[PDB]
Amino acid sequence: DELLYLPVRGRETYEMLLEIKESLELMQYLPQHTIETYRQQQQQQHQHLLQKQT
Amino acid sequence: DELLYLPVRGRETYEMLLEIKESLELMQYLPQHTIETYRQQQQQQHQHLLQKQT
Amino acid sequence: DEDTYYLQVRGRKNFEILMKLKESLELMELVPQPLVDSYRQQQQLL
Amino acid sequence: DEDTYYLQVRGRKNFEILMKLKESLELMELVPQPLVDSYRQQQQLL
Amino acid sequence: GSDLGKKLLEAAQTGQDDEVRILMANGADVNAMDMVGMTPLHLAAVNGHLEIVEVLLKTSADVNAQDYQGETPLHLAAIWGHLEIVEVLLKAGADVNANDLVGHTPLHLAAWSGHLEIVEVLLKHGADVNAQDKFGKTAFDISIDNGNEDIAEVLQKAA
Amino acid sequence: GSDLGKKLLEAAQTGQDDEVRILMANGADVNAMDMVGMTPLHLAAVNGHLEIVEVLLKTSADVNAQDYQGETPLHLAAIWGHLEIVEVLLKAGADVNANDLVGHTPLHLAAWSGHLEIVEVLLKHGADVNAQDKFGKTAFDISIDNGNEDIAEVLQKAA
């Protein structure tokens, strides 16, 4: 949990990294019941695999 | 092209952001002939769309 | 947005990064707005 | 890795971020190693 | 951070009662903080792990610890609807009027989520109905925004 | 940065000859730098845009400008096989022995890529065959690594 410092050239890259970093960190606030509901949804999504057809 | 500074808690997040940032910045070094070859490859990939079947 | 999109990516390590971010971006949406707001306020103070 | 992987993501804005990173991660592989090495050396000096 | 600290954070989050007790017995830092500054008590509160909350409240763990967003365990038990945990935190001296970085109290967050019974418990412990957030909003204001008219009635009556 | 500077960087990269001339006439900064510190001359060199390189070399643009990685336009024309651009950069006073952050010369990068004719031109302009990179490697060492035995013969004969 050391506070590291990422040098970023330019707004566009900085904002992209911020949005990603936000998404990574804010998962901590979710209860495991929420995580498990997501995981089951994701598992059921598999029952119907993606394939190149159309 | 201002030098902005992204505060990151922890190694794992920092390293993930570094790898993403690297990928974003190093595209600048590619010639447009390389970019166009990629874009055509990506376009031809469409001819066969992804769909949920199997 | 709520609807579902497909992509293809070359490279397992690329796929693993994208699946980690797919997860965090999808789960991010379940975080109550007030906690998102406190988080953005914190990033601002830095 | 060289082989192709599929994912699904909910949300257009999520899809747009992942497609931007799919592009940069796939193209990153075409960058000559010597330029990758100079770039990593620079990030180190900071 | 420490190694045991990270493990205690994950055990508390994932409800591993026995692993929490073993980690603590082996010296795990009850004040360890995750990447958003949450302690094991915060994570047990988020994740609805009553027994783990009760275990941590027997330690020197700060019931009013604030993460990097100003959230206390009580904020997080309140927003996620964990009534029994709200009760034990308040019994342990949780600040019922703790303010996070955007000026939300636990009452704001219980109002936002629509947890009527938690609003009633927070009020019983003297929750401040007049406390306004960054954007001028009381709990009563939020409960209106989110169509929680039932909480908006309880808050109006308290005002 | 500036607005015109970013546009000139994109016009040079994408080979928009007419747009480069219009941007320059309107005051676009020939020393503008992209996110990796490349100037329009670097980007014209990467992207193989000879006419745009020649236009920029009539300006006060530094033929030996270094990006944040220490790369000069000559490094980048060399690695990407742009023989005619290598020639005009050297005619304009490009440092044939410029060293980037990991100690690569343009000869290292032409060796790495397998651009024999560019190796021959760099040698004609007095490229240093003995210059060793961060990892101890000469051009001759690299050309071995990358199965460019033809360049390894040319470099051995120069040594």
Author numbering:
A (entry chain A), B (entry chain A): 359 to 412
C (entry chain B), D (entry chain B): 351 to 396
E (entry chain C), F (entry chain C): 1 to 159
Quote the study on this structure.
All members of the p53 family form tetramers in their active state through a dedicated oligomerization domain that structurally assembles as a dimer of dimers. In contrast, p63 and p73 form hetero-oligomers of all possible stoichiometries, with the hetero-tetramer built from a p63 dimer and a p73 dimer being thermodynamically more stable than the two homo-tetramers. Here we report the generation and characterization of Designed Ankyrin Repeat Proteins (DARPins) that bind with high affinity and selectivity to the p632/p732 hetero-tetramer. DARPins are small kDa proteins consisting of multiple stacked helical hairpin units in which certain positions can be randomized to select tight binders for a folded target domain.
For a structural understanding of the interaction and the selectivity, we solved the X-ray crystal structures of complexes of both DARPins with the p632/p732 hetero-tetramer stabilized by mutations, thus the same DARPins that were used for the in vitro selection. For the DARPin selection, we used the same p632/p732 hetero-tetramer construct of which we had determined the structure and that is based on rationally designed mutations in the p63 and the p73 ODs that enforce the formation of hetero-tetramers (by inhibiting the formation of homo-tetramers). The combination of an E363K mutation in the p73 OD and a K377E mutation in the p63 OD thus selectively stabilizes the p632/p732 hetero-tetramer. Of these DARPin F11 represents a DARPin with three internal helical repeats and DARPin A2 a DARPin with only two internal helical repeats, always flanked by an N- and C-capping repeat. Titration with the DARPins yielded dissociation constants of KD = 10 nM for DARPin F11 and KD = 17 nM for DARPin A2 and a 2:1 (DARPin : hetero-tetramer) stoichiometry, while a control DARPin did not bind at all. We also measured binding to the two homo-tetrameric ODs of p63 and p73 by ITC but could not detect any binding, demonstrating that the interaction of both DARPins with the hetero-tetramer is not only highly affine but also highly specific. A detailed structural analysis further revealed that both DARPins bound to the hinge region between the first and the second helix of both p63 and p73 ODs. This second helix represents a special feature of both proteins that are not present in p53, and this explains why p63 and p73 interact strongly with each other but both do not interact with the p53 OD. The structures of DARPin F11 with the mutant p632/p732 and the wild-type p632/p732 hetero-tetramers were indistinguishable, displaying the same intermolecular contacts.
